[PDB]
Design a protein around this motif. Structure first.
Motif, PDB file in Angstrom:
ATOM      1  N   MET A 167       5.769   3.927  -5.196  1.00 51.27           N
ATOM      2  CA  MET A 167       4.683   4.043  -4.234  1.00 51.27           C
ATOM      3  C   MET A 167       3.329   4.065  -4.926  1.00 51.27           C
ATOM      4  O   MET A 167       2.378   3.438  -4.445  1.00 51.27           O
ATOM      5  N   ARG A 206      11.293   8.116   4.037  1.00 48.94           N
ATOM      6  CA  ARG A 206      10.006   8.360   3.397  1.00 48.94           C
ATOM      7  C   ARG A 206       9.275   7.054   3.119  1.00 48.94           C
ATOM      8  O   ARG A 206       8.065   6.949   3.354  1.00 48.94           O
ATOM      9  N   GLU A 209       7.916   5.669   6.314  1.00 53.33           N
ATOM     10  CA  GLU A 209       6.687   6.367   6.671  1.00 53.33           C
ATOM     11  C   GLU A 209       5.518   5.861   5.836  1.00 53.33           C
ATOM     12  O   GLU A 209       4.412   5.660   6.349  1.00 53.33           O
ATOM     13  N   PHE A 210       5.748   5.655   4.541  1.00 55.29           N
ATOM     14  CA  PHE A 210       4.697   5.134   3.672  1.00 55.29           C
ATOM     15  C   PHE A 210       4.216   3.769   4.153  1.00 55.29           C
ATOM     16  O   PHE A 210       3.007   3.512   4.250  1.00 55.29           O
ATOM     17  N   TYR A 213       2.239   3.958   7.168  1.00 51.48           N
ATOM     18  CA  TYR A 213       0.937   4.536   6.868  1.00 51.48           C
ATOM     19  C   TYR A 213      -0.023   3.469   6.375  1.00 51.48           C
ATOM     20  O   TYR A 213      -1.175   3.400   6.820  1.00 51.48           O
ATOM     21  N   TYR A 214       0.432   2.624   5.452  1.00 50.95           N
ATOM     22  CA  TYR A 214      -0.421   1.542   4.978  1.00 50.95           C
ATOM     23  C   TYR A 214      -0.341   0.293   5.848  1.00 50.95           C
ATOM     24  O   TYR A 214      -1.140  -0.629   5.647  1.00 50.95           O
ATOM     25  N   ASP A 295      -5.589   7.945  -0.060  1.00 51.01           N
ATOM     26  CA  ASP A 295      -4.334   7.340  -0.473  1.00 51.01           C
ATOM     27  C   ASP A 295      -3.167   8.273  -0.191  1.00 51.01           C
ATOM     28  O   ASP A 295      -3.286   9.496  -0.304  1.00 51.01           O
ATOM     29  N   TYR A 296      -2.035   7.684   0.186  1.00 51.34           N
ATOM     30  CA  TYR A 296      -0.802   8.438   0.367  1.00 51.34           C
ATOM     31  C   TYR A 296      -0.506   9.234  -0.894  1.00 51.34           C
ATOM     32  O   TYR A 296      -0.235   8.655  -1.951  1.00 51.34           O
ATOM     33  N   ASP A 297      -0.558  10.558  -0.795  1.00 54.40           N
ATOM     34  CA  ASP A 297      -0.379  11.400  -1.969  1.00 54.40           C
ATOM     35  C   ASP A 297       1.029  11.242  -2.518  1.00 54.40           C
ATOM     36  O   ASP A 297       2.008  11.608  -1.858  1.00 54.40           O
ATOM     37  N   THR A 298       1.131  10.700  -3.725  1.00 55.90           N
ATOM     38  CA  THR A 298       2.405  10.507  -4.406  1.00 55.90           C
ATOM     39  C   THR A 298       2.422  11.453  -5.602  1.00 55.90           C
ATOM     40  O   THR A 298       2.051  11.081  -6.717  1.00 55.90           O
TER      41      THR A 298
END
Ligand SMILES: [Mg+2]
Lengths: 352, 62
Positions: A167, A206, A209-210, A213-214, A295-298
């Motif tokens: 991700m 997950r 969902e990512f 989200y983008y 940004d999606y916190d990875t």
């Protein structure tokens, strides 16, 4: 069985007023046949017949059992076996009957497709191997993201192929291209799927969902078929035979810096062998969807407990937390760069 | 600029004042000698004037 043209001619000439007998004479057909066809719906030129008995019918179940349980596909062996049973014909019928059961040899023709601008992207991994970086043996992997219409190439080296790393590399690719595609093509990795549920694909929750989200729609090519993503595989060959052949390094940061410089110098500058144009111009032609501000916190998220004194331990590390945070539960957000932050019920701890 | 038009005017010039220019010694336009010369009839068809070259097709059909 007068053909389409013959029937059309008969009907037309008859309806024109021409006499029927000389019509038959002209078309070389019997008068009764022509007259019958006068009052007919459409040209009759087809005869339907069903299957018929053959010589290898009694042996067919036995041959099918041989093929499907003994795995025998040698026509000579099966012929020699059934000949004793009573068969007397040649092997051509046997080969013709057995051909469908044989495995379909892989084709060699390769369809070519050209995706629309800002419409598709491809992603893949390349296990470079094991290297002693700074006296530490790590499994180096290369992540490659190839745009479909401009043939751009972003790449980055990593020590792991965890969903978090995947991700984060996707975030880096999207930032590099200045936007997100409308479709992203992977191979069947468990970090993106969980197997083919009777032909249909089950997306990792997950990762789904990512993607939502983008906004980019995931796709997976197929089990054991990498041709569908040839762009990125060929880019991998390009990078591994051009950049990582003789280049020497001691830190992964140095390697990534060199890789980005090399890409922006030659890889995304040299014109493509098929599009015949510099990838950056096509990039300028691309129209990707805008990136989200945050940004999606990875980052690894773990819950830990603070010792009695206030000494908190994570991995092979130690902190000194205020007494008020002793014996309680805290969250340890570990970013992939190593920035560890401590949270306690939303608040952030000024860990020493 | 086009060499084709240059050759077109060259053909006109050849038909006008080159093939009809008498030689000082002979004193006769060469066209008469050409007419009396032996020009056996050509086969009335042209041997192919096209470049012949082989090319292998990749498994991509290209
Ligand atoms: Mg792969």
């Amino acid at each position: 069985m007068i053909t389409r043209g013959e029937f059309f001619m008969i009907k037309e000439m008859y309806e024109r007023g021409m006499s029927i007998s000389d019509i038959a004479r002209e078309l070389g057909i019997d008068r009764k046949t022509v007259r019958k066809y006068i009052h007919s719906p459409n040209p009759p030129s087809k005869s339907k017949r069903k299957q018929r008995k053959s010589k290898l019918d009694p042996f067919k179940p036995y041959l099918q059992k041989r093929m499907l349980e003994d795995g025998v596909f040698n026509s000579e062996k099966l012929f020699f076996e059934i000949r004793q049973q009573g068969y007397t014909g040649g092997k051509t019928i046997l080969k013709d009957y057995m051909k469908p059961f044989r495995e379909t040899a892989k084709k060699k023709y390769t369809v070519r497709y050209e995706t629309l601008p800002g419409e598709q992207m491809q992603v893949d991994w390349k296990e470079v191997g094991e290297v002693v970086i700074e006296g530490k043996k790590v499994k180096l992997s290369l992540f490659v993201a190839t745009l479909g219409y401009s043939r751009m190439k972003y790449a980055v080296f990593t020590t792991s192929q965890d969903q978090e790393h995947l991700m984060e590399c996707l975030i880096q690719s999207f930032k590099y291209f200045g936007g997100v595609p409308k479709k992203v093509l992977f191979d069947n990795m468990k970090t993106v799927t969980d197997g083919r549920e009777q032909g249909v694909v089950k997306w990792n929750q997950r990762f789904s969902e990512f993607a939502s989200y983008y906004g980019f729609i995931p796709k997976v090519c197929r089990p054991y078929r990498a041709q569908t993503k040839g762009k990125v595989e060929r880019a991998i060959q390009y990078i591994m035979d051009h950049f990582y052949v003789g280049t020497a390094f001691e830190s992964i940061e140095e390697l990534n810096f060199l890789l980005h410089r090399w890409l922006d110098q030659v890889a995304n500058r040299k014109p493509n062998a098929t599009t015949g144009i510099s990838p950056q111009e096509r990039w300028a032609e691309e129209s990707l969807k805008p990136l989200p501000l945050k940004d999606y916190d990875t980052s690894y998220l773990s819950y830990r407990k603070v010792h009695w004194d206030g000494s908190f331990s994570y991995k092979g590390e130690q902190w000194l937390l205020s007494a008020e945070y002793a014996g309680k539960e805290i969250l340890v957000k570990e970013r992939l760069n190593g920035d560890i932050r401590l949270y306690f019920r939303g608040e952030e701890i000024s860990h020493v």
